[PDB]
Amino acid sequence: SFSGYLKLTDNVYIKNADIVEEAKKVKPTVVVNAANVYLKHGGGVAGALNKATNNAMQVESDDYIATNGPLKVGGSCVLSGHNLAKHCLHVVGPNVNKGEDIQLLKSAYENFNQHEVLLAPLLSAGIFGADPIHSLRVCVDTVRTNVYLAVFDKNLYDKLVSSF
Ligand SMILES: NC(=O)[C@H]1CCCn2ccnc21
Fold this sequence. Notes:
Layout: E1 6-7, E2 12-16, H1 19-26, E3 30-35, H2 44-52, H3 56-68, E4 76-80, E5 87-92, H4 104-110, E6 117-120, H5 132-142, E7 146-151, H6 154-162
Parallel strand pairs: 2-7, 3-5, 6-7
Antiparallel strand pairs: 1-2, 4-5
Bound molecules: (8S)-5,6,7,8-tetrahydroimidazo[1,2-a]pyridine-8-carboxamide.
């Protein structure tokens, strides 16, 4: 099971870890991807998770979009976890760099409540442009299920823990 996590609350845990390496190690029931509405896994967490699947995540995602159309900002879909997890929950947090409404971050985290346990990144953090400290606060105030947050950047992880 999950090892080395700092317990933030009753249900939120955090670790300075590479989410791809973490997923390969734990093989969780659910790994969350920091997805965009088109499921184009080009960079950040999505680019790293997709590269770990040898592009199988992108091939599956393109078929999903061809059938269903784009996701909503704040929405999600459950697809295969490939070699990383049983399932991948692709969650679209607002991208502040695209001028998307930061208020949608709570809706994005609500998707986590449909899964009893998840390995996840901080939604809208990194290349999505939101403040990761704010993302962690929305996570702990929205998610009620057991979430294991992986924060790649050590300096950001320390800042998140020290300011919690
Ligand atoms: N893209 C991210 O935020 C994480 C994803 C796992 C690997 N990794 C390397 C650099 N940063 C990361």
